[PDB]
Amino acid sequence: SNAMKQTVYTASPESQQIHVWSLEADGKLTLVQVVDAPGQVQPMVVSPNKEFLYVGVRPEFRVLAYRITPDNGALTFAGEAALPGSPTHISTDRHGRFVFSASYNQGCVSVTPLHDGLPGETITVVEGLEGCHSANISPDNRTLWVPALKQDRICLFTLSDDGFLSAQEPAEVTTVEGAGPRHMVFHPNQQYGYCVNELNSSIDVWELKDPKGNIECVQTLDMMPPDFSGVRWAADIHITPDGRHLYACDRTASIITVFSVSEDGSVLAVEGYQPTETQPRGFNLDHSGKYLIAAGQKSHHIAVYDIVGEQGLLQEKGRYAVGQGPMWVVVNAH
Ligand SMILES: [Cl-]
Numbered sequence: 464s465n466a467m468k469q470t471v472y473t474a475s476p477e478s479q480q481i482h483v484w485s486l487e488a489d490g491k492l493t494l495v496q497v498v499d500a501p502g503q504v505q506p507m508v509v510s511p512n513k514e515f516l517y518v519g520v521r522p523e524f525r526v527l528a529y530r531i532t533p534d535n536g537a538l539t540f541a542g543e544a545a546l547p548g549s550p551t552h553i554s555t556d557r558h559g560r561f562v563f564s565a566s567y568n569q570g571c572v573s574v575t576p577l578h579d580g581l582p583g584e585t586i587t588v589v590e591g592l593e594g595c596h597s598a599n600i601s602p603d604n605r606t607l608w609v610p611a612l613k614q615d616r617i618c619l620f621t622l623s624d625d626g627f628l629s630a631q632e633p634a635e636v637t638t639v640e641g642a643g644p645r646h647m648v649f650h651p652n653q654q655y656g657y658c659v660n661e662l663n664s665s666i667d668v669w670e671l672k673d674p675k676g677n678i679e680c681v682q683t684l685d686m687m688p689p690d691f692s693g694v695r696w697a698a699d700i701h702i703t704p705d706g707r708h709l710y711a712c713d714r715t716a717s718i719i720t721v722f723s724v725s726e727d728g729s730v731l732a733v734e735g736y737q738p739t740e741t742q743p744r745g746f747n748l749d750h751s752g753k754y755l756i757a758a759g760q761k762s763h764h765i766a767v768y769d770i771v772g773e774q775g776l777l778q779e780k781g782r783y784a785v786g787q788g789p790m791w792v793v794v795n796a797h
């Protein structure tokens with residue numbers, strides 16, 4: 464048993480709801496709360512100190528702060544701040560002092576300061592990042608990695624102590640033409656990053672510091688079955704905290720591709736394909752890495768899977784109704 468007590472948060476923008484579930488060590492979910500958001504909530508992130516759930520809402524572009532009740536993970540609206548564009552992805556720095564928002568439509572990444580955990584007036588906005596789709600702080604907290612999907616690049620910005628962003632040298636790393644870099648995760652060992660490319664459903668493995676001190680792409684892998692000929696539409700990517708397994712999903716095929724991760728994190732290998740909730744845009748892993756929770760944007764349900772064996776293949780355990788068009792999942796241990 465993972466001996467953990469956890470909460471699962473899901474975003475259902477088409478019904479303007481956030482669902483809160485208690486997740487027991489045995490994988491069973493129980494509904495804790497349903498929140499009516501003041502608009503369509505899409506991205507969500509738990510603060511590093513676990514006091515808040517920060518979420519992105521439209522059409523009144525904002526990051527909303529919901530205070531988390533420690534015992535059961537329930538939410539209470541606590542504050543908000545305006546954003547310069549519709550939030551596509553939300554995250555924080557390693558120390559929970561800033562919220563980063565990537566806006567696809569406004570092609571920008573912005574920084575929101577936190578004061579006693581509450582979001583304040585935007586302190587900077589970096590525009591000109593067409594298709595800006597995520598902002599991902601490096602393991603060492605110095606560099607914000609920002610996929611610009613329509614520019615086939617991941618922009619690299621130094622984050623100052625005061626929350627400002629400015630281009631590094633080099634200012635970016637590039638993907639193959641038309642790949643459409645979207646979401647990424649870093650290996651727990653802090654040495655590699657993994658980016659899922661939407662438009663060609665591929666995963667790029669990025670070495671963060673090679674012997675010359677440079678960032679290099681050291682592997683590119685197709686996440687689709689060899690017999691796939693449809694429209695590639697990849698979405699999310701997550702790695703288990705034990706570093707053994709990596710998962711990515713495609714919205715057209717409605718699959719989660721299962722990858723093994725070499726011991727040093729430098730090599731991925733496809734282990735299998737798991738049919739999942741229809742049109743999976745968002746999923747996540749629990750804090751133990753024993754469970755994967757996937758949302759179906761066209762199923763209106765989440766599915767809980769056991770992660771099993773040395774390959775990390777998935778075995779469905781349960782299925783739960785959420786709101787309409789669920790597309791974001793996060794899990795908090797407490
Ligand atoms: Cl630099």
Ligand SMILES: [Cl-]
Pocket residue numbers: none
């Ligand atoms: Cl250094």
